[model samples]
Target: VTLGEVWKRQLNMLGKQEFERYKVSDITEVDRTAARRYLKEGRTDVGISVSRGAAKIRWLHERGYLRITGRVLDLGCGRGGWSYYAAAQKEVMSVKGYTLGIEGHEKPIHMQTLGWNIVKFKDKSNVFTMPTEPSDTLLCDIGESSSNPLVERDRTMKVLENFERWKHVNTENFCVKVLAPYHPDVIEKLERLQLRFGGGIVRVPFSRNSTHEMYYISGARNNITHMVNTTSRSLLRRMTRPSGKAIIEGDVFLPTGTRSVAGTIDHEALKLRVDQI
Candidate 1:
C-alpha cells in the first residue's frame, strides 16, 4: 500500500480528545477517517495489543526501512500489544515476548488470532533464550510502572552475556530502552562495550516522555587490527541540539574529490551511502 494511505489509516484512529491534547494537527483529511476507524476497531487482542510500541513499528518502517525479517524480541509486552503488532505481519519470522508474566493476556490465543508465532520463555523475563540467528535486534520498549533498577541491571548483564556467546550477534546491534535518568549509565555501558570489543555504538533518542528513553546500539565484530580500525573509525560526535557546531569528517576512496580522499572513510560504497544520507 502507498505510504500516504497507510499513514492516514493509522493516524485517523486518534480520538478527538487525544488529538487536541497532543496537538496532533498535522494529519491530513484522508487520514482522519482512517484514524477514527482505528479507534472504533479498538485495541488488538492480548498478543496484539495496540500501543505506542506497535505504532512505532509501523512509524519507523514507513517504507520498510527498519523491516525485521528474522526474529523479533519484544520485551515486557504488556497486554501483548507489541507482540500482536509484530505478529500481525511477516515483518519478523517469529516474535517472542519475555516478561515475568503476560498479565491477563493469553500468548497462544493472540498468536493464533494474529497468525504469528509467539512464545514466552518458561523462565522469568530476566532469562531470555533467543533462537539461533547470526544477527538479531534486542528491543526493550518498557520502563514505566514495571521498571526496577536492580532488575534492569541484572537483566542487562544477562542479556549482554547471552549476546556475547554468539560471535555474529555480539557484533550486531543491541537496541535497548530505559528511563531518561539512566542515559548516562547506559552510555557508559556502551562505551565500555566499545572498548572491550572495539566496536561502535549508535545512540538514538525518541520523543520526550515523562520517564522513558530509547537507544539503539550496533557494532561490528573483527580482530584486533580490524577492531582498532573499527574503534578509530566508529567515533561518533555529541552536540547539543538547536545550536551547535556541526563537525563533519569522513573519507572516500578516490584520487581526489571535494571531500577527504584518504581519511575517515576508505571505501567508495560507504562514501556513496554517506553522501546520500
Candidate 2:
C-alpha cells in the first residue's frame, strides 16, 4: 500500500525544532552534525537508528520495494521500535505492533508512547505460543536458541513460518530475521515452502554485529535456486571462519529476560548455523 502523507519531525529526545533532511548519499560526519543540529534546533523527530536505517529504507523506497500500502503487522514487536518507524515513515500507511510476550517494567508505557496498540490472544491452545504468530506480519527479534523455551521457539518458528508468510504476502519482497548459524530444519522448510510457493531466499548478513541474519525471499524460481546455492556456499565458507567467542559485556538479555548471557558465541556449524548460548 502506498503510504500517505505524514509529518516529518525529529524525536522528542533530541527535540523536533532541530530537524534537517540529509541527502541520501552524503550522510557523512558533517551531515550527521547538521542532523544533530537540526534535532537540537527543534527537529526532535529523527532518531539515530532511523537515520542510519533510513539510507537502506530510502534505497528500497526509491526502487519501489517497501510495502507501504497496507496495514503493517509487527509481530513480537519489542516496544514497537520498528513499528513506530514504519508507521512514521512516509511509505507506511499504518502499523499494528504486536508484542505477544510480556514486557519489562519500562516497556509497557513505551508501547503506547510509540503509538502501538497492545493485543492479547489468550493461549487458546498450544497452536499459539506466547511469542509466535500473534499477528499477521510477524517480525520476532529472537536471534537464536536459549535456555528459555520462549526465545528458543520464537526465533525458530519465526524463521520457519515468516519466510512462507512473506512469500505469500508480497511475492517479490519479504525479509526474515534469523541468526548467524541458521537451523538446518529452517532451511529445509524454507526450501520446501519455496518450491510450493516459488521464490528464492536472499541471506543478508550484518557484518559488524554478526548476530542476526536477514533472509530476503523474492519471486522467480530461478532467483530462489540462485539464492539457495549462494546461501549454501556462504554458509560453508562461514563455517570455515574461526569461532567468534567473546566474553559477554554487562548483562545481555534475550527476549526472555529470566535467562541472560555473559557474551555471544556466533559461528556457523555444518548445515546448522551455531549460535552458542
Candidate 3:
C-alpha cells in the first residue's frame, strides 16, 4: 500500500492523538546518554541495548525506514514492553502518529492467568496470536527480547524464513544490566529491570535472572545473513564473559520517592551476602 493509503487505514483502526512529537534529542539523550558512561565494557552480566531498542525504533522512523506499508509482526515479544510502550504507541510521532498495522499476541499464560492485568478479552475481540496469513510486510518490524539468548537466537532464525523482504529492528541480549545506579551514563536510567517494582536497590545483583538488550536494525534481502552470523558469534563471545557479580551503595528508596543520591558496585568482586534483610 502507498504510505497515504496505509496511514488512512491506520487512522480508522485507532478510532483515536494531538500530543507533541517526542523531541528526538529528548528521547535519545535518555537512552544514549545512558551509553556515555560504563564505556569500559566491564565484565558484567548486562548491556544497555534494551533502551536502545526503543531509541532504534524512533531512529528508524526518522531515518525513513519506517514506510509502514504492511503488517508488523513482533517475535519473542517479552511482556510486550516495546510493542505497547513504543511500537503501537506514539512515543515518537505523538501529534500526527498512527499505527500502520495491528499488533500481534503475547505469551506467559501462567503469569497472565495469575490475574495480572486483572482482565482479558472475555470474548470481546479477535485473538491475534497466530495471524491468518503472512502478509506481514514487517517482521516484528521493531522486536525485542530480554529473554536469555538461548531462546532468543532461535526466534531470529525462525523469523528470517518469513517476509525478510521487509525491515526489522531487534533488541536482543548481549548481556545483563550490570551497571549500578552510580554508573555515570545510566544513573538509574535502567535502575535494573528486575526487582524494579519502581523501587530502589535490591539486595541481590539487579539483573540476576534477566537479560540486557542491544539493537540490531537491518533491511530486506540485504547482507542480513552475514550480519546475523557476525552478531551471533560476537554475541556468544560476550555472553561467555566473566561473571559480573556486584551491588550498589545505599539500599534506599528510588526515584519514584525521595531518591538516593549515589550508587555503585564492584563488578570484579565475589561472594553473595544476606546482610540487607
The candidate maximizing TM-score is 2
Which segments of model 1 are wrong by more than 4 Å? Answer: 1-49, 61-67, 89-91, 102-114, 118-124, 128-135, 142-173, 181-184, 195-206, 219-277
Residue range 34-140, candidate 1, lDDT tens digits: 32344356522322223334454443334332444455665555545455555555444555665554464323222223433233322244424545434354455
**lDDT on C-alpha atoms for all candidate structures:** 0.38, 0.35, 0.26
TM-score comparison, 1 vs 2, better candidate: 2
Model 1 residue 254 CA deviation (Å) reads 46
Residues 129-228, candidate 2: write the lDDT tens digits.
4333322233333344354434543566665665454333433343344443234455566667666755444443322222224344332244544554
Model 1 vs truth, CA RMSD: 18.0
Best by lDDT: 1
Off by over 4 Å in 3: 1-52, 70-131, 134-136, 141-153, 161-221, 225-277
- CA displacement after TM-score superposition, residue 238 of candidate 3 (Å): 10
> Distance (Å) between predicted and true CA of 164, model 2?
5.4
Per-candidate TM-score against the hidden true structure: 0.44, 0.46, 0.28
Is 2 or 3 the stronger prediction by TM-score? 2
